Each structure stands twice: as structure tokens, then as C-alpha cells.
Amino acid sequence: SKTYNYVYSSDPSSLNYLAENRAATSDIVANLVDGLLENDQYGNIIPSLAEDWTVSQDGLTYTYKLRKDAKWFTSEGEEYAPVTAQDFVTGLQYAADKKSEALYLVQDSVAGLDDYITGKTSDFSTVGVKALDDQTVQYTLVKPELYWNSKTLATILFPVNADFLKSKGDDFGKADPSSILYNGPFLMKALVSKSAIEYKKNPNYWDAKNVFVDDVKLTYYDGSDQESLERNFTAGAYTTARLFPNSSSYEGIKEKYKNNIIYSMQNSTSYFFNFNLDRKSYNYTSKTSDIEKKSTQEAVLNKNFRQAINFAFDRTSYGAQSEGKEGATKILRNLVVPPNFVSIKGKDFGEVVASKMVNYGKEWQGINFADGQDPYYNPEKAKAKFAEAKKELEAKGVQFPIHLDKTVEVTDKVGIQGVSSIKQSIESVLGSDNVVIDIQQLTSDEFDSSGYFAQTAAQKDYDLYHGGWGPDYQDPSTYLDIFNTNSGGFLQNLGLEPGEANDKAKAVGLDVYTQMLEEANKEQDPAKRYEKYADIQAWLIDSSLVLPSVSRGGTPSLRRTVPFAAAYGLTGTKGVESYKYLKVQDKIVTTDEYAKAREKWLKEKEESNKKAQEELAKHVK
Amino acid sequence: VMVKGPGPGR
Numbered sequence: 001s002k003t004y005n006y007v008y009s010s011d012p013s014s015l016n017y018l019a020e021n022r023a024a025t026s027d028i029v030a031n032l033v034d035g036l037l038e039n040d041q042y043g044n045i046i047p048s049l050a051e052d053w054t055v056s057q058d059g060l061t062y063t064y065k066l067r068k069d070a071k072w073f074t075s076e077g078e079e080y081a082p083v084t085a086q087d088f089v090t091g092l093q094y095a096a097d098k099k100s101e102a103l104y105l106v107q108d109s110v111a112g113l114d115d116y117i118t119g120k121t122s123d124f125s126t127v128g129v130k131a132l133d134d135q136t137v138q139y140t141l142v143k144p145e146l147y148w149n150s151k152t153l154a155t156i157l158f159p160v161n162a163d164f165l166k167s168k169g170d171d172f173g174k175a176d177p178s179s180i181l182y183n184g185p186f187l188m189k190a191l192v193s194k195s196a197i198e199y200k201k202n203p204n205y206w207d208a209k210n211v212f213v214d215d216v217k218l219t220y221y222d223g224s225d226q227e228s229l230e231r232n233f234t235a236g237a238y239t240t241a242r243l244f245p246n247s248s249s250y251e252g253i254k255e256k257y258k259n260n261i262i263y264s265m266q267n268s269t270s271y272f273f274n275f276n277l278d279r280k281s282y283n284y285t286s287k288t289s290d291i292e293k294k295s296t297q298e299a300v301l302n303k304n305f306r307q308a309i310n311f312a313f314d315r316t317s318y319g320a321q322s323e324g325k326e327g328a329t330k331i332l333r334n335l336v337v338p339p340n341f342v343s344i345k346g347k348d349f350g351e352v353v354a355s356k357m358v359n360y361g362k363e364w365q366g367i368n369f370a371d372g373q374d375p376y377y378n379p380e381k382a383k384a385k386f387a388e389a390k391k392e393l394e395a396k397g398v399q400f401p402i403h404l405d406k407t408v409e410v411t412d413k414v415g416i417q418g419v420s421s422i423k424q425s426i427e428s429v430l431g432s433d434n435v436v437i438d439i440q441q442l443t444s445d446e447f448d449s450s451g452y453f454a455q456t457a458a459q460k461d462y463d464l465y466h467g468g469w470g471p472d473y474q475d476p477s478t479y480l481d482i483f484n485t486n487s488g489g490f491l492q493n494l495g496l497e498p499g500e501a502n503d504k505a506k507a508v509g510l511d512v513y514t515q516m517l518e519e520a521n522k523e524q525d526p527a528k529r530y531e532k533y534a535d536i537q538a539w540l541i542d543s544s545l546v547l548p549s550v551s552r553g554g555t556p557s558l559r560r561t562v563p564f565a566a567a568y569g570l571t572g573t574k575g576v577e578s579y580k581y582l583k584v585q586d587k588i589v590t591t592d593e594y595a596k597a598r599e600k601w602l603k604e605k606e607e608s609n610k611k612a613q614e615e616l617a618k619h620v621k
Numbered sequence: 622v623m624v625k626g627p628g629p630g631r
Contacts, residue, residue: 009628023624154622221629229629242629269624452625470622489623552627566631573622576631 001214004239007221011193015180016173017155018094021101026155030577031186036064036152039569042605044612054621059144066135069206075177085131087159092129095156102156104487111140150474153572185211185580194220212583223412243556245324262594266371266551270333271468273547275300278495278504281461285405286438299402301507304389306544311382312429315374321417330554334369336479344530356538379429386430401436404463410441457492465493471571476533484514559589563597
């Protein structure tokens with residue numbers, strides 16, 4: 001049989017795909033539960049549980065016909081029940097009742113849903129999801145959304161069987177394979193914390209013909225043994241291996257695999273640094289006095305200070321820590337929205353953002369937002385902005401240097417080198433009499449509970465954070481909404497809570513940012529809409545409330561996977577996250593073989609995208 | 622979706 005063997009690095013807090021917005025959950029559930037639609041190898045949206053669909057002429061009513069052979073299975077593979085339209089009613093009501101962390105995807109879109117969530121109504125029958133019959137689910141929206149179908153690839157719109165959900169109660173969706181039912185390509189055979197994730201092909205899945213591996217086995221990787229990836233690939237145990245050009249082992253690796261190193265493309269997941277604008281927790285700090293803590297609290301609210309950090313942060317040096325000197329720039333990402341995420345009359349989003357920067361000050365003159373280069377690092381500009389910040393901050397009694405805590409996992413050797421790089425860059429440019437980056441090396445549990453898995457803003461224990469966003473649907477709002485003060489998914493990472501904007505949020509202008517988002521969202525013409533979102537992205541770059549850093553992809557690997565066999569998606573959870581479509585082979589792929597396959601894929605993608613646009617018109621009814 | 626990393630994945 002055919003097996004894929006590699007590693008994983010993030011244990012999930014749960015399998016609750018209806019309540020979670022973390023990739024630690026959806027990366028797993030992508031393989032276990034299907035929704036209405038999915039992706040092909042080219043990023044087109046194709047049938048999944050829904051074999052057909054229509055949209056009304058006014059754009060408000062979407063109706064999906066579910067295929068009759070789709071079933072729910074237990075973790076052991078036994079059939080539980082057919083998938084029915086009611087399962088989509090159940091899923092949305094459960095997501096609403098549980099206050100899902102991904103509710104922003106649906107709460108302002110589905111008719112009646114906001115009223116139900118906020119208690120203006122108590123009757124879910126007034127909410128715009130209905131099972132018209134066992135095979136037909138109908139959604140009613142508040143306003144047209146050309147990106148609505150792309151939202152169905154997000155797990156909050158996935159179904160759940162109501163009887164199973166009732167039987168499980170509070171046990172539903174725990175980190176245990178028996179806590180959910182399965183209707184997707186795989187069953188989960190093992191889920192062991194800090195050890196293993198194992199998938200087994202479900203032979204009775206409706207689309208089993210498109211599952212080309214029988215088993216997927218992932219061993220836990222904590223970052224302490226980066227050479228283990230190539231070592232186990234060469235030993236024949238892993239199907240692929242990410243390469244680390246800084247290793248002492250790399251010279252021998254590049255000689256042995258001179259014709260096999262493959263670089264991936266940068267993808268739509270964007271990372272950035274942000275500041276904690278309202279820090280409450282100080283378990284992990286080098287500050288020892290209230291004056292230091294209050295000084296840092298003031299500094300992060302100062303725009304000139306944030307801009308000075310931005311201009312002092314050498315992204316090339318940062319990327320070199322993981323990619324080596326020659327690949328250092330291959331991972332660089334300079335906006336939250338990828339520069340090619342959308343186009344406006346033939347011009348990419350990033351070029352439009354650059355043109356909007358003309359109105360945000362001389363410090364942005366000539367900026368270029370293309371991937372793969374560093375347009376931010378500029379020591380002279382950083383020093384000048386810092387001088388302005390220092391005058392403003394000293395007048396408030398702020399003490400210098402400003403100490404900024406950044407966390408990192410003690411086992412994450414490459415991550416330690418990355419954070420050491422930012423410390424060296426910022427302190428070298430601005431002076432350690434002005435800024436100190438204090439690196440806090442934490443255990444796994446401490447790192448989790450003070451960051452990604454912290455449950456409130458008050459538990460965020462750092463001054464600087466380095467997280468990222470993967471897009472949920474095909475519109476710039478998926479990225480730019482994450483900082484809005486009403487419901488932004490990234491607010492807690494900034495130390496803020498969704499709701500009324502507090503004095504810290506207003507001090508940095510996030511109330512104004514939120515009003516801008518509301519106005520842009522009303523625009524229905526794509527070109528005008530995207531231009532308004534480009535101005536919003538420009539505002540955010542200027543605010544330096546985010547410091548764009550890197551993307552996923554752009555990295556070297558060795559591979560025994562078949563090039564371009566897997567699903568690909570610009571947004572959602574049904575692309576690279578899924579082991580459906582993926583194929584393995586005996587031969588180690590060569591760089592030349594991969595390049596030939598890539599050119600074929602690029603060409604076919606354009607052809608297939610054009611066909612997919614023509615297929616769309618047939619669905620208007 | 623909220624992401625961590627980046628680390629060695631697919």
C-alpha cells in the first residue's frame with residue numbers, strides 16, 4: 001500500500017471545527033469532515049458534499065443539492081447515518097450557540113443570524129439556513145457576496161449530525177478521534193499529544209477514488225532536531241524533508257541532492273509582528289519595575305515608535321536564519337493581504353496599495369510591496385522616527401530604553417535564531433540605550449498558554465507577537481477585518497477584546513480603521529471595493545500596528561510526492577491542508593522534473609480558471 | 622484562520 005510519512009508540529013486544543021478558528025484544528029479536520037464545496041488542483045471551487053447548487057438572481061439565496069451517497073462514519077469506519085441537509089442547520093445553530101471564534105464569517109452575512117446570536121430573537125427558525133428536504137439546504141443572505149461559495153470551504157459552514165452532537169454533549173469535538181463523526185477522505189486512527197497524528201483512508205468515502213494514499217503518519221517535531229527531516233528522508237522513512245541551509249550538514253546535503261532541491265512558491269498565508277497594546281500579564285518579562293512596564297505600555301501606543309521598530313527590523317537577516325544567506329529573501333511578505341491576492345483592472349493589489357501610500361507621508365515614498373524583497377529596513381529612517389518618538393514619550397515621563405518581551409519555545413532552535421536576529425537588528429539600528437528586545441525562552445505549555453492558545457487578551461504575556469493569518473474566503477476583508485474592534489479575530493493578540501473600543505484602541509486609531517472597513521464592505525463593485533480595501537491596507541502599514549514579515553512557502557525541500565497532484569486553494573481549508581488527491585512515488589523528484597510540472601500547472605491553471613468562470617453562469621436561477 | 626509557525630508542514 002501507499003503511505004505518506006512525515007511530521008507535524010502543532011497539537012490541536014480540540015477537534016471542534018464548529019467552534020475553533022485555529023489552524024491547529026482545521027488543518028486536521030480538513031481530512032476528516034467535508035463541507036458543501038472543495039478545491040481541485042488549480043484552486044477552482046468544485047463539488048464536495050453538494051453535487052449542484054444555484055444562486056438567485058438577486059444574489060441572496062444559495063441552494064445546494066447534496067449527493068445521496070454521502071454518509072457519516074465513526075472513527076472506526078462504521079456507517080452512522082446519511083449526511084442530510086438538516087446537518088447544515090444543526091452546524092450553524094451549534095456554532096451560534098457556542099459563540100464560535102469564527103462567527104465573523106457568518107454573523108453579518110446570514111439573514112437573522114446576528115439577531116439570534118445577540119439575543120434580539122430566540123427562534124432559530126428565523127435564521128437563514130433551512131433544510132428544504134433531506135438533500136437540499138438553502139442559505140439566505142443579508143446582502144450579495146460573490147465570495148459566499150468560497151466561505152463554504154471554512155469549517156464553520158461544515159455539517160454535524162444532531163443526534164451524535166446531542167449524545168456527546170460537552171464531549172463533542174474534544175481532542176479524541178471518537179469525539180466527532182467522519183464524512184471526508186480519511187478516518188483518524190491516532191491522535192496522541194506530542195507524539196503522532198495518523199490518518200487512514202476511508203474506503204467508503206464518496207470520493208475514495210481521489211484518495212491515493214492509504215495511510216498518512218505524522219510524527220511530532222518540536223524543532224530541536226532540524227536535521228532529522230533530511231536524515232529520515234534519506235533513510236527512507238519520510239516522504240519529504242524540509243531543508244535548512246544553515247545546518248552544518250547542508251554542504252553535504254547539497255552535494256548529495258544537487259539535482260533534487262525544490263523550492264515551493266510563497267502562498268497566501270501572511271505573518272507579521274504586532275505589539276501588545278494593553279498588556280496585563282507579566283509572568284515572562286525582564287522588566288523589574290512599574291516604571292519600565294508603564295514606559296513600554298506608552299511606547300507601543302506611539303505611532304513614531306512603532307514605525308521606528310518597523311524601519312529597524314531587517315527582514316533579510318531574519319529570513320536568513322531559516323533559509324540561509326542565499327534564500328533569505330525568498331519568504332518575505334510585505335503586506336497582510338498578499339500583493340497578488342486580487343487585481344484591480346489588471347493591476348495587482350500590492351501596486352494599488354503602494355500608490356495609496358503617497359498620501360501617508362514622506363517616510364513611505366517609493367515603497368514597493370512585492371514579495372521576495374525588504375522595502376522596510378532603513379536605519380537612517382528608523383533613527384529619525386525614533387528621535388521623534390523619544391521626544392513625545394519623554395514628555396510623558398517615559399524611561400528609556402524601552403524593553404520589549406518576545407517569546408520563543410526553548411526547543412525551537414531555528415525560531416531562537418530568528419528572534420535573536422530581530423533583537424540584533426533593532427538594537428543595532430536604534431541603540432540598546434533606546435530599545436532592548438528581551439527574548440523569553442519558554443516551555444511548550446508556557447508558550448502555548450501565553451500566546452496562540454491563550455483564551456483571553458489578559459493572558460497574552462509578551463510585548464511583541466509573531467503570528468499569522470490564513471485567508472478564509474476570496475476577498476481582502478478576510479485579512480483586513482482581523483483588527484476591527486467589533487469582532488476582529490486578531491484583537492486578542494493585540495491585547496484587545498472584541499466589543500466597544502477601549503482607550504488603547506482609540507489611541508492607535510483602530511476605531512477609525514473599523515469605520516473604514518464598514519464603508520469598504522458596503523461597496524459591491526469589485527474594482528471599487530478592492531481600491532477601498534487597498535487604502536485600508538495602506539492605513540494599516542502606515543500605522544505600523546503590524547510589521548509584515550514572511551509567508552508560508554518559498555522554502556527548499558526534497559520530495560517523493562508527485563508534483564502538483566494535490567489540491568490547491570487560495571483560501572479555505574480544502575487545499576494543501578488535505579491529503580486527498582496527493583500521490584506518492586518511489587523516485588526522488590528532480591528540480592528539472594518539478595520545473596516542467598510547474599510550467600504545465602501554471603498554464604493549465606489559467607485555462608481551468610477560465611472554464612470555471614464559464615461554468616459559474618449556469619448556476620444563476 | 623489563525624496560524625502559528627511557520628514550521629515544516631506539507
